[PDB]
Write an enzyme that holds these catalytic residues in place. Sequence first.
Site, short mmCIF file in Angstrom:
data_model
loop_
_atom_site.label_atom_id
_atom_site.label_comp_id
_atom_site.label_asym_id
_atom_site.label_seq_id
_atom_site.Cartn_x
_atom_site.Cartn_y
_atom_site.Cartn_z
N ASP A 101 0.76 -1.19 0.21
CA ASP A 101 0.05 -0.03 0.03
C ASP A 101 0.89 1.07 -0.01
O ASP A 101 0.48 2.10 0.79
CB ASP A 101 -1.11 -0.15 1.21
CG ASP A 101 -1.96 -1.00 1.09
OD1 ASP A 101 -3.00 -0.81 0.44
OD2 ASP A 101 -1.56 -2.04 1.85
N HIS B 42 1.08 3.58 -2.48
CA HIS B 42 0.35 4.86 -3.03
C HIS B 42 1.20 5.75 -3.71
O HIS B 42 0.84 6.89 -3.44
CB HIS B 42 -0.52 5.49 -2.19
CG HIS B 42 -1.83 4.74 -1.72
ND1 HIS B 42 -3.11 4.79 -2.13
CD2 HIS B 42 -2.02 3.37 -1.01
CE1 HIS B 42 -3.96 4.05 -1.91
NE2 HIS B 42 -3.58 3.39 -0.96
N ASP C 46 -1.73 -1.95 -4.31
CA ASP C 46 -1.80 -0.73 -4.22
C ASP C 46 -0.71 0.14 -3.96
O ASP C 46 -0.46 1.02 -3.29
CB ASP C 46 -2.99 -0.28 -2.88
CG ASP C 46 -4.13 -0.63 -3.34
OD1 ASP C 46 -5.23 -0.66 -2.60
OD2 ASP C 46 -4.64 -1.29 -4.31
N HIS D 232 -6.82 -2.53 -10.00
CA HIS D 232 -6.28 -1.58 -11.08
C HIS D 232 -6.99 -1.80 -12.37
O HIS D 232 -7.93 -2.81 -12.46
CB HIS D 232 -4.84 -2.07 -11.18
CG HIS D 232 -4.42 -3.64 -11.73
ND1 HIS D 232 -4.81 -4.65 -10.72
CD2 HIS D 232 -4.24 -3.96 -12.83
CE1 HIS D 232 -4.35 -5.56 -11.39
NE2 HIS D 232 -4.08 -5.52 -12.65
N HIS E 184 -5.48 -9.43 -1.51
CA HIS E 184 -5.96 -8.10 -1.66
C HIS E 184 -7.18 -7.77 -1.48
O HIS E 184 -8.06 -8.14 -2.44
CB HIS E 184 -5.24 -7.60 -2.84
CG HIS E 184 -5.33 -5.93 -2.85
ND1 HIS E 184 -4.38 -5.13 -2.44
CD2 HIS E 184 -6.35 -5.16 -3.44
CE1 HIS E 184 -4.94 -3.96 -2.43
NE2 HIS E 184 -5.93 -3.82 -3.09
N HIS F 126 -4.22 -3.78 1.30
CA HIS F 126 -5.46 -2.84 0.91
C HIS F 126 -5.83 -2.04 2.27
O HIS F 126 -6.29 -0.77 1.98
CB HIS F 126 -6.48 -3.87 0.59
CG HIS F 126 -7.67 -2.74 -0.17
ND1 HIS F 126 -7.42 -2.21 -1.22
CD2 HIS F 126 -9.22 -2.59 0.35
CE1 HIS F 126 -8.76 -1.33 -1.31
NE2 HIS F 126 -9.77 -1.73 -0.63
N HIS G 115 -4.77 0.49 5.33
CA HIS G 115 -3.78 1.30 5.45
C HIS G 115 -2.98 1.26 6.75
O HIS G 115 -2.00 2.09 7.00
CB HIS G 115 -4.31 2.89 5.28
CG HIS G 115 -4.53 3.09 3.60
ND1 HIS G 115 -5.15 4.46 3.46
CD2 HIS G 115 -4.75 2.33 2.60
CE1 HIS G 115 -5.53 4.17 2.17
NE2 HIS G 115 -5.19 2.95 1.65
MN LIG Z 1 -4.52 1.00 -0.21
MN LIG Z 2 -6.63 -2.00 -2.42
#
Ligand SMILES: [Mn+2]
Ligand SMILES: [Mn+2]
Lengths: 329, 324
Positions: B17, B19, B61, B97, B180, B216, B218
């Site tokens: 994750d 990002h 992610d 995605h 995920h 997934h 955070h």
């Molecule tokens: Mn995420």
């Molecule tokens: Mn995700």
Amino acid sequence: HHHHHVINLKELKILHTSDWHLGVTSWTSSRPVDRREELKKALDKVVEEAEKREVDLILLTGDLLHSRNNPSVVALHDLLDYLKRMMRTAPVVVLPGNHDWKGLKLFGNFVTSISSDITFVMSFEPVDVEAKRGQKVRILPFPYPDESEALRKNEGDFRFFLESRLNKLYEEALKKEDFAIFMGHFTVEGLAGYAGIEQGREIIINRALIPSVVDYAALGHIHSFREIQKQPLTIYPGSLIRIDFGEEADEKGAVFVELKRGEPPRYERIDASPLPLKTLYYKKIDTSALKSIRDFCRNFPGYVRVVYEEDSGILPDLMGEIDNLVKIE
Amino acid sequence: HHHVINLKELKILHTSDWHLGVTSWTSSRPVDRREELKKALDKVVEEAEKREVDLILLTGDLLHSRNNPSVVALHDLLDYLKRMMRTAPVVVLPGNHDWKGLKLFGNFVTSISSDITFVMSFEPVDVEAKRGQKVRILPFPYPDESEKNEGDFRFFLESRLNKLYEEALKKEDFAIFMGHFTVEGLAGYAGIEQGREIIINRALIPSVVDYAALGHIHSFREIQKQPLTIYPGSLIRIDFGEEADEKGAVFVELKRGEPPRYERIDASPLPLKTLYYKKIDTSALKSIRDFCRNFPGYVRVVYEEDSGILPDLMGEIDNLVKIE
Ligand SMILES: [Mn+2]
Ligand SMILES: [Mn+2]
Ligand SMILES: [Mn+2]
Ligand SMILES: [Mn+2]
């Protein structure tokens, strides 16, 4: 499957192929013909040859994808499939043609870093690669001047820019080890019987400016096989299929090049055996012409265009009757 | 790879994750998070090297934009992938995605290098770790839709998990679930529903795997112990609401016949703070200015009673990023 290491090896076997145009469907405005089957048959023939001839190095000189902006998933898949097949035979060096999607560039540099069997050259910077039997090859790449696809300068300065790049590649070629290979994607100036820009802005280069000190000059962008000059040996392999009418008389295929230190280079064409094209011309569409068209297309294994000038009224359904008649104009 | 073969032990770097590419608070005061994010990624990479990990797991992610990642974000992604590959083989389970170019890229790259594997289907993959350990990967990505009846969909998901459990039983040295999704009944989870979410009961995670690597979510979360199931969490505090969670990666050590162990690799993220006020008065205005002055992170002000036109707070306060 790593590289061999042969001491005192003065030979280099090259497969050079170009201008695949993967993804192309022809004559979309009259009778769309997906060229994939024919194209893959040609590519398989080329791959089989590289294997048979046990080449040391494979050069791909651009326009491998028909769509410069948005290649389909099938076209990209086909490209990566053939890249993989080639890599298993010998190290591959790729000089892609004109493109706009940054995805290829990011992809290229990453893949180059993680594998010793593929190199993407996407700038004018020389790269030193190692061939199948350990031969050291300096690559002197000349792609389409990126960023400035719009010159932002007059023709004089732009020509001088191109010319300066070529002089620099010449100087870098002199610092070679075993072999030196120029790879270019452009239009040689004063090409005999060259049609013209196929809907694109062209980069025109005098053949004399190609660094004379290289062992081979591998060019792409032109769809016809052409031996441009002998010193240095400079070749466009041509495309693998006849992409549109006008390409009826072309030779299509790849090339096998053999380099030996201290000796002149030699080459052999690898012919693609493409499907043929024919344009039929008639003053008027009459029963004499109407039977001429039907007769010709009947035993012709390729695609046919009919051109006529004089009005002949509502034509009979020739295309619904003749499967290989792809255009009437 | 090395060829001991380590057989008994396997050291894992699990991170998720990222990002990459995210700019926060674009509609009030855009803050490009790249500098902070790369600082955390460098820390994580440095740790994988120091700890001499055998295997690196990335659980989705990794890019903030699911549809159109920028060139800088993709460049950073590929940069860090290359760095990680130099340390240990990497297994990538992409998140939710689009573009599909990621998929073409993934399978090709997996074929050409033995130091990276993209898992983008439910099919198990057998990989080889740094010291020759044989690892079976049981991947569970976002399904490609699908999404008819909620009963048949839940049954579809359930059938995938049982399948993975079955092929988990094969194995050799180790077996590792990568998923995920959102674990059902997460304590203190917001926002739920999203509602673009895949909800899975934790008991459905194949019990016979050595480790279950999830992404997934955070926040760092030890979901369960048998099998050890962890969300590493993100590396930065992406938005307000993530003020209190733990951010970082995880180091996991597996030993055959022994229980798994793990240590967090904390990201030391920049802090976030929301300040609440009945109304914006001089006593409130004072506390805002003074708080932000020595606060190394980003601040949001939320106020209830309308206090008319506000003095230029954000103009005089560099780290006040939102008022609402
Ligand atoms: Mn995420
Ligand atoms: Mn995700
Ligand atoms: Mn072309
Ligand atoms: Mn071209």
